[PDB]
Design an enzyme around this catalytic site. Structure first.
Site, PDB file in Angstrom:
ATOM      1  N   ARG A   1       0.059  -9.787  -2.598  1.00 16.08           N
ATOM      2  CA  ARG A   1       0.408  -8.637  -1.735  1.00 16.08           C
ATOM      3  C   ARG A   1       1.865  -8.134  -1.916  1.00 16.08           C
ATOM      4  NH1 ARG A   1      -0.476  -6.541   3.681  1.00 16.08           N
ATOM      5  NH2 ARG A   1       1.369  -6.439   5.045  1.00 16.08           N
TER       6      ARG A   1
ATOM      7  N   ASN B   1       6.288  -3.534   3.283  1.00 16.42           N
ATOM      8  CA  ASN B   1       6.065  -2.834   4.530  1.00 16.42           C
ATOM      9  C   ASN B   1       6.538  -3.578   5.765  1.00 16.42           C
ATOM     10  OD1 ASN B   1       5.363  -0.224   5.439  1.00 16.42           O
ATOM     11  ND2 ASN B   1       3.313  -0.828   6.182  1.00 16.42           N
TER      12      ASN B   1
ATOM     13  N   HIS C   1      -2.731   2.759   2.014  1.00 18.09           N
ATOM     14  CA  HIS C   1      -2.969   1.311   1.987  1.00 18.09           C
ATOM     15  C   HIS C   1      -4.483   1.110   1.991  1.00 18.09           C
ATOM     16  CE1 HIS C   1       1.104  -0.301   2.973  1.00 18.09           C
ATOM     17  NE2 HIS C   1       1.287   0.963   3.308  1.00 18.09           N
TER      18      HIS C   1
HETATM   19  N1  LIG Z   1       3.809   0.421   9.800  1.00 18.92           N
HETATM   20  C1  LIG Z   1       2.576  -0.268   9.559  1.00 18.92           C
HETATM   21  C2  LIG Z   1       1.401   0.550  10.049  1.00 18.92           C
HETATM   22  C3  LIG Z   1       0.385  -0.528  10.558  1.00 18.92           C
HETATM   23  C4  LIG Z   1       0.220  -1.747   9.603  1.00 18.92           C
HETATM   24  C5  LIG Z   1      -0.173  -1.318   8.165  1.00 18.92           C
HETATM   25  C6  LIG Z   1      -0.738  -2.443   7.290  1.00 18.92           C
HETATM   26  C7  LIG Z   1      -1.171  -1.838   5.948  1.00 18.92           C
HETATM   27 SE1  LIG Z   1      -1.892  -3.237   4.741  1.00 18.92          SE
HETATM   28  C8  LIG Z   1       0.338  -3.477   7.032  1.00 18.92           C
HETATM   29  O1  LIG Z   1       1.370  -3.068   6.407  1.00 18.92           O
HETATM   30  O2  LIG Z   1       0.217  -4.670   7.493  1.00 18.92           O
HETATM   31 ZN   LIG Z   2      -4.280  -2.810   4.864  1.00 16.50          ZN
HETATM   32 ZN   LIG Z   3      -1.104  -2.393   2.647  1.00 12.47          ZN
END
Ligand SMILES: NCCCCC[C@@H](C[SeH])C(=O)O
Ligand SMILES: [Zn+2]
Ligand SMILES: [Zn+2]
Ligand SMILES: C[As](C)(=O)[O-]
Ligand SMILES: [Zn+2]
Length: 304
Positions: A122, A139, A192
């Site tokens: 990831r 993220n 995503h």
């Molecule tokens: N700012 C993140 C919006 C909600 C979580 C998104 C998911 C996508 Se895999 C994550 O990053 O865990």
């Molecule tokens: Zn996701």
């Molecule tokens: Zn993601």
């Protein structure tokens, strides 16, 4: 080598960014906004017919290495732009009046790794002090409630926030690009997989943005539009209550910079295949997602 209906390795996508730009010089230009940990160029395509003082929409894919349908969708978006410009009234209006910055793969080092060593990786592939565990969750690496909820402080964990906000070369490159272009960028879209959702801020705390009603209504209508095609069911809402709390996200960060339309998309499926979504679903997933992205694009254009 390249096909829009298969998953393409990084060499192939990189070559595609060059070739698609060469084949469509009046609609596409290419730059690199930085280099990754391993020194790979982070390419960005600017898609749109030149014009004065154009607003822009920024879209990225490939934050997370295993979410292969994200990388395929940014390619499909460019495929649609060049194929339908001139024929389809909306996409032609979109490209004449706004520019789209399309960043097809942010975490290129992780993406290569998923092709060579571990399909289920990831994070980035940078090192961490004090351990042999590799990588940061990009993220969770943005300066938005950084490292406080829904992020791990353990470098060996899949949601590790990193050593500091913007510690990763890739997230620093993206944040620098957006800050450098803030006066033109009117919306931020980050793609995503999986679980079929359209999220907007906030995820770093249980709080709602100033324009909550507008975002809520827009996400509701874009999910309704997505479903027209194949009946695929998405949920939507603010991140913290729609999926989970998760601090350090680029969507929240971008919204806090003043980009009022900021959305995270989690594409197909709901877990039957999860991250290993078969190639035979690329076309249907990308086509339906195109309807939600065009819906959002039209809205942004109409409410400048
Ligand atoms: N700012 C993140 C919006 C909600 C979580 C998104 C998911 C996508 Se895999 C994550 O990053 O865990
Ligand atoms: Zn996701
Ligand atoms: Zn993601
Ligand atoms: C189902 As998920 C939030 O790990 O992409
Ligand atoms: Zn199409």
């Amino acid at each position: 080598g390249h096909s829009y209906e298969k998953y393409n390795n990084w060499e192939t996508i990189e070559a595609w960014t060059k070739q698609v730009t060469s084949e469509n010089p009046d609609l596409i230009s290419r730059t690199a906004i930085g280099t990754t940990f391993l020194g790979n160029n982070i390419y960005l395509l600017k898609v749109g017919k030149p014009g004065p003082n154009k607003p822009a929409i920024f879209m990225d894919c490939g934050f997370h290495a295993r979410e292969w349908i994200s990388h395929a969708f940014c390619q499909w978006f460019v495929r649609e732009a060049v194929l339908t410009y001139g024929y389809e009234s909306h996409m032609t209006e979109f490209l004449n009046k706004l520019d789209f910055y399309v960043l097809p793969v942010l975490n290129i080092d992780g993406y290569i790794y998923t092709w060579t060593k571990n399909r289920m990786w990831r994070k980035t592939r940078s090192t961490n002090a004090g351990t042999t565990c590799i990588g940061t969750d990009p993220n969770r690496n943005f300066d938005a409630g950084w490292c406080t909820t829904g992020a791990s402080t353990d470098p060996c964990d899949e949601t590790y926030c990193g050593s500091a906000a913007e510690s990763e070369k890739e997230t620093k490159a993206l944040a620098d690009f957006i800050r450098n272009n803030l006066s033109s960028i009117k919306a931020y879209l980050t793609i995503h997989s999986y679980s079929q959702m359209i999220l907007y801020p906030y995820s770093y705390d249980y709080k709602l943005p100033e324009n909550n009603a507008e975002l809520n209504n827009l996400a509701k209508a874009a999910v309704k539009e997505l479903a027209t095609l194949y009946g695929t069911k998405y949920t939507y809402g603010p991140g913290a209550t729609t999926i989970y709390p998760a601090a350090g996200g680029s969507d929240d960060w971008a919204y806090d910079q003043g980009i009022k339309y900021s959305f995270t998309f989690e594409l197909r499926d709901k877990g039957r295949y999860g991250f290993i979504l078969p190639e035979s679903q690329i076309q249907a997933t990308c086509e339906e997602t195109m309807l939600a992205i065009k819906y959002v694009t039209n809205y942004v254009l109409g409410h400048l």
